[PDB]
Write a protein that binds this ligand. Structure first.
Ligand SMILES: Nc1nc2c(ncn2[C@@H]2O[C@H](COP(=O)(O)OP(=O)(O)O)[C@@H](O)[C@H]2O)c(=O)[nH]1
Length: 318
């Protein structure tokens, strides 16, 4: 009754897992040393895969090496057994990571690899890679304990369902992340719908016909127009705002969405257009609650959730 049930919905990589971690950070029990420890294998895997993508890129993009001696380290990492039990699970043990760390460190120092990194628009590199590559100092310490920020940036896909249960001032929340469905649809108070707002110029890896924003808009359409959710507060999170702010400076959304009007290099104009894209998916209304978020930024999410909490209670009361 007093229980607020919130679903997190949105395509994969939209920031749902990261939002759940922020709830634990902000309103729950912060990860203790053993909890943080469990992330270490994922972080190491994120780094190994990222550098593997970068060595593969500069090769396939024909960028010349910075120092030609790094070929050896490129080969070293291209020979990493992805197939193996642990690695196939998106996990790399400490001892294994430390075997590669010298190659990784030398490769990130390379101007050719730095060049490859700059042309990342041209291939698929995980959001966390540069953050961890610049943090090779601390990951490489024999008893590295991941920090809060490291855990937020650690990328592991969600295959099933995650839940975190927390209270704010004796108000209990049940928050459920359904990966990117109909079984958790029961007794829902609010839906937070996460969008990677910076992916307007990307297609689905498994379906190059489909624009990633288009894929998000179509998912949203099926939710927002379902009668089952008529009394449910639906709140749009245009996430990855830090990335959208960078991308608008260099890419024009008009090239992708012919309906855009305004200045495509103006973040505010682009955000206005995205909001209108989602609003326009609804068949029978005229407020779509929305926030421009950066799910990895704890201070942002603190403010946003404060606002969302008020929205839900104002609505969920009335
Ligand atoms: N730069 C940036 N990275 C983000 C943001 N939100 C999430 N990420 C990262 O993007 C990746 C995908 O996020 P994740 O929560 O796992 O998406 P999920 O598949 O919906 O659960 C992770 O590495 C997150 O750290 C954001 O707002 N900005």
């Amino acid at each position: 009754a007093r229980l607020v049930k919130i679903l997190l919905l949105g395509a994969g990589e939209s920031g749902k897992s990261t939002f759940l971690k922020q709830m634990r950070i902000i309103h729950g029990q912060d990860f203790d040393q053993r909890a943080r420890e469990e992330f270490r294998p994922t972080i190491y895997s994120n780094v190994i895969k990222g550098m593997r993508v970068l060595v593969d890129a500069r090769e396939k993009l024909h960028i010349p090496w910075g120092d030609n001696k790094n070929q050896l380290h490129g080969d070293k990492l291209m020979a990493f057994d992805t197939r193996a039990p642990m690695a196939a699970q998106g996990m790399v043990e400490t001892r294994v990571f430390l075997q590669y760390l010298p190659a990784i460190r030398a490769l990130w120092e390379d101007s050719g690899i730095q060049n490859a990194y700059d042309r990342r628009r041209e291939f698929q590199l995980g959001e966390s890679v540069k953050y961890f590559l610049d943090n090779l100092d601390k990951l490489g310490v024999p008893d590295y304990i991941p920090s809060q920020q490291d855990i937020l940036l650690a990328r592991r896909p969600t295959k099933g369902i995650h839940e975190y249960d927390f209270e704010i001032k004796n108000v209990p929340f049940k928050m459920v992340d359904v990966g990117g469905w109909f079984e958790c649809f029961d007794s829902v108070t609010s839906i937070l719908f996460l969008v990677s707002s910076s992916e307007f110029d990307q297609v689905l890896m498994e379906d190059r016909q489909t624009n990633r924003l288009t894929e998000s808009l179509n998912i949203f359409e099926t939710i927002v127009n379902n009668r089952v959710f008529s009394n449910v507060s639906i709140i749009l999170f245009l996430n990855k705002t830090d990335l959208l702010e960078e991308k608008v400076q260099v890419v024009s959304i008009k090239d992708y969405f012919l309906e855009f009007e305004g200045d495509p290099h103006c973040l505010r104009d682009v955000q206005k257009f995205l909001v209108e894209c989602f609003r326009g998916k609804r068949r029978d209304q005229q407020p779509l609650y929305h926030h421009f978020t950066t799910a990895i930024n704890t201070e942002n999410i603190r403010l946003v959730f404060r606002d969302v909490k008020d929205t839900i209670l104002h609505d969920n009361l009335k």
